[PDB]
Structure formats: C-alpha cells, structure tokens
C-alpha cells in the first residue's frame, strides 16, 4: 500500500533529504499540503490508522491534547518564524505546531552532518519518548547525535506541519514600510514570492552558537583556557565493540589516578574525558594546552583561544594521533583499531574547540514595533546560553528555553501587554544558567509549557515591567 510504504519510508528514514521526499510523497498520495499546521496532522492520522501507526498517533495525540494547547487553539491567531533547524529549533517549532500556530522554519544547510554525541537529563529523555521517539530511532541511552536528534525532530515537525525551508539563511529583518503592513525577513539568497512576503508576528532564533538578531546583547566571559577535543571512530556493531563500556566523565576529583596511568604510557595530560558509545564511538577530551603543544597538536602559543585553535594553528596529524592515543588508553584497546570517521566535508571527524568562551545573551527575548506593527523574538538554545560540553547541559536548557519561549509566545497571543510578556519571559530566563536535574522538580512525566510544572517554587515577577523597558523597541 503506498501511502503505508511512504509513511514507513519517511519514518525510518536516515537522511534529512530522505525525510523530505518520502513526507512529500505521502502528502501527494494522501492528497494534503505539507506545512498546513495541525490540520494536516489530523488528515495525515485519519487516513492512516493502521496499527502499525498507531501507538504513534495515540502519543503525539495524548500530548497535543494537554490542556495548556487547548487544543491547537491557543496561539491561533499567531504566525512565526523559526530561524534554524538544529535541535532546540526543531523542538520550539513543534511547541509552536501544537499551540495552534502557524510555523515556518528556515535553514540555512541542507543536511544534518554532526556525528557529535549529546548527554540527555531524564526529563528531555522522557520528553523525547513522549513525541514517538521510539517509532523515529531504532536505537545505553543517555545519550544521541545531534544528528540523529534533527532527524527525530524534523519528522515530528512535519507531521504537526510546520513548513520548513531549507538552504535559506536568516540575514534580518524588513521593517513594516507604513501603516497594514507587517514584519518580513531578509533571506539569502533572494528567497522566492512565498518566503519573500511571508509575514510573521514572532521570530524565534536558534541559529546556534554564533547568531543572534541585531537588537539582541550577549555577555561574553572569558576564564581560563580550557582545550576541547572531541573525535569520532567507526562502530562496526562487532560483539567486542559492543562490550566496552562506556566512560561517563571521569576528571580530576571523580575518577583520577586514571590520569596518572595515561599521561605514563601516552604523554598525553588531560582533564577530562568521556567515551560515548553511539552510531559512532565518540570521545570528548579537555586537554592541557601546555600538552597540546608539547605532542605537537598546536604548532605555537597563541594568547588568542581562535588563532590557538584556528586550522593555521593545529596539525592534523598530530590531532589525529592524540586523539587516536587517549581513546584507546580509555578503551584499553577492547575497540579494536580504531578507524577516525569522516568528517561534513571528508576529513577524518576530530576536532579542537574552545572550551573557555561560554557566551550568555543578556535577554532571552525582545519586542520590536514599527508603524503599529510588533513582532515578538525570542533566543533558544546554544545562542541563548552557550553549553560546557562536558557537563552535557546543552539538549537540556535548550529544550526548557524552548518551553519557556512558547509559553511566552502563548501569553503573547492572549493578549498580555508586551512589558508584560518580557518581564515573564526574563523571570524565568534567570533560572536558566543554574538549572539541574537536582534544583527542577522531580516529576519529568508532568513537565509541560507551564514552567511552574518544571520549576519549583516559581516567581514570575522576578523582572518588572519596567527592567524590560528596554527591551521594547
Ligand atoms: C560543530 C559542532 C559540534 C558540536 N559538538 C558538541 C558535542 O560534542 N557535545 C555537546 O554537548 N555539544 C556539541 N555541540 C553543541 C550542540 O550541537 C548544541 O548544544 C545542540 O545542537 C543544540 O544547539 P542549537 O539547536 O541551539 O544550535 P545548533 O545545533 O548550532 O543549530 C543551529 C542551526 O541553525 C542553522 N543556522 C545558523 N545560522 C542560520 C541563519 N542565519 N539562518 C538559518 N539557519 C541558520 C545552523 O545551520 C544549524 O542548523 C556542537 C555544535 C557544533 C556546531
């Protein structure tokens, strides 16, 4: 049955152009348009309620029918835009979806190419479950790639029908000219009619580390030096592979001496490491600079982190060697020879980062109005707070920025005063830098948009009115 064989193709599908034609395959059989909010969720379900498909309607149904949603009618008067595709994009454009709103979502890449691995807190693993995780991803679990997590989340985001636009850059804003007419977008390249005059009431960034609408300050601290190198290997799935167990974090304090057995053996000095095994195996290491250069890995010192770590500066074999070096000494061999994966553009897939310059926006949200027209934005994710690797906080305040944002976006469509909104917003966006699984509340199963179900003892007057006036305009 090939509306059933398009269904099936697009959700076990592996590759973000896979995921398109087999969703716009299934649109085209089922007769629907992609994009068409949760109209088109409900026409795509009714017409395939086939047992197999089941279990996965009956869980996105079971959350788009929290009473917070009601019921896709609360934000649906509302239209978005939502600039990035990474995870936290994805994840705020289905809370979007579910309101009620109209989403588009433009990217400017055309893959998902990062093999990188991802820590989960329970809450955003029981989160995940609860969207059809399981009829997404095959495949401890504590973990995933970031790519594997895009796949996840755009095949939700489609099936809720958000319209996503893909190889388009997010470059600005185009003001209302007068009076009636609304905020547009600036796109690279000159995007076509629809996106060029697609407009829009709220614009959620998460374009990652490096971007933030102009208008927005970040705050940038810069401490002490800290080396990240992270690397990915082949996993044939072997039995003896398969058997390694993997390394949470190890450290000083935590678990150490084993430092001491490396650095004799190896001559390689770190901080940290983490083994996790996933679609690749992967490692994370802090490493000493003083290290890096005496093996070779950086070929001067550099007071500046970004020439420090800049292509000039690293030697790729020396990396490559390290790297190879420190993940067999954690493994103790048991991996085999281990085969470097390769890499967005065919290298071998290691790599050197800053771990030191952890950026923070100075609000997670502003208003901007112009000829009577506003237009709500709002930060998630890695360009709203930048995460420590290591610590693996980045799925997890990423997704509770998401939460946040469509709760304001939510209190944005009911009518409250934009002050209003942004004082609430940044009332909770004050948690946001010390949230643990240990300060939350303990019951993830009922985390929802509300924050008081995620936030214990809540204070949603933190911020005035008037500590976000100048956030308005
Ligand atoms: C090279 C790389 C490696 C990483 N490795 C790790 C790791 O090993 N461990 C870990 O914990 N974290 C790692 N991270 C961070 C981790 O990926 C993020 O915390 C997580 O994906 C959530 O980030 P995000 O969704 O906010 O932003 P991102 O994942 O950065 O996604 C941003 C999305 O926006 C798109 N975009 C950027 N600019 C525009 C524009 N102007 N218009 C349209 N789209 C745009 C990007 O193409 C990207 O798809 C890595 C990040 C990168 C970039």
Redesign the pocket.
Do not use: S
């Given at each position: 049955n090939p509306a059933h064989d398009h269904f099936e193709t697009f959700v076990q599908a592996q590759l973000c152009q896979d995921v398109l034609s087999s969703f716009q395959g299934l649109c085209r059989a089922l007769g629907v348009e992609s994009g068409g909010g949760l109209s088109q969720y409900h026409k795509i379900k009714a017409q395939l309620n086939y047992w197999s498909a089941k279990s996965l309607w009956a869980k996105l149904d079971k959350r788009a029918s929290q009473p917070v949603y009601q019921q896709g009618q609360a934000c649906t008067n509302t239209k978005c835009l939502v600039?990035?595709?990474?995870?936290?994009?994805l994840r705020a454009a289905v809370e979007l979806a579910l309101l009620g709103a109209r989403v588009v979502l433009?990217?400017?890449?055309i893959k998902f190419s990062?093999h990188?691995?991802?820590?989960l807190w329970p809450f955003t693993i029981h989160d995940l479950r609860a969207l059809g995780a399981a009829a997404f991803y095959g495949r401890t679990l504590d973990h995933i790639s970031?790519r594997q997590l895009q796949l996840l989340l755009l095949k939700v985001a489609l099936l809720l029908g958000v319209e996503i636009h893909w190889g388009?850059?997010?470059?600005g804003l185009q003001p209302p000219p007068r009076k009636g007419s609304g905020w547009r977008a600036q796109l690279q390249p000159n995007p076509p009619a629809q996106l060029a005059s697609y407009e829009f009431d709220v614009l959620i960034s998460?374009?990652?580390?490096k971007?933030v609408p102009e208008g927005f300050t970040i705050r940038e601290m810069r401490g002490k030096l800290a080396i990240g190198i992270?690397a990915n290997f082949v996993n044939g799935r072997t039995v003896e592979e398969t058997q390694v167990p993997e390394i949470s974090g190890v450290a000083r304090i935590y678990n150490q001496k084993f430092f001491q057995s490396l650095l004799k053996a190896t001559g390689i000095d770190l901080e940290n490491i983490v083994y996790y095994k996933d679609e690749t195996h992967y490692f994370?290491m802090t490493a000493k600079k003083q290290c890096l250069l005496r093996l070779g890995v950086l070929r001067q010192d550099l007071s500046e982190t970004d020439q420090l770590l800049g292509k000039a500066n690293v030697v790729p074999e020396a990396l490559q060697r390290f790297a190879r070096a420190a993940a067999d000494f954690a493994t103790h061999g048991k991996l085999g020879k281990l085969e470097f994966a390769q890499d967005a553009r065919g290298r071998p897939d290691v790599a050197a980062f800053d771990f030191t310059s952890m950026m923070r926006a100075e609000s997670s949200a502003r208003v901007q109005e112009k000829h009577g027209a506003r237009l709500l934005l709002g930060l998630?994710?890695?360009?709203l707070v930048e995460?420590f690797?290591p610590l693996?906080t980045?799925?997890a305040r990423?997704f509770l920025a998401a939460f946040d944002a469509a709760w304001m976006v939510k209190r944005w469509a009911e009518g409250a005063g934009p002050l209003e909104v942004l004082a609430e917003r940044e009332s909770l966006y004050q948690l946001l830098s010390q949230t643990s699984p240990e300060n939350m509340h303990r019951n993830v199963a009922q985390y929802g948009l509300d924050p008081a179900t995620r936030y214990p003892n809540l204070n949603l007057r933190a911020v005035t009115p008037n500590q976000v006036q100048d956030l308005y305009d």
């Open positions: 600039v990035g595709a990474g995870p936290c994009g433009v990217e400017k890449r990062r990188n691995v991802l820590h970031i388009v850059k997010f470059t998460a374009a990652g580390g971007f992270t994370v998630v994710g890695d360009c995460p690797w693996g980045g799925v990423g």
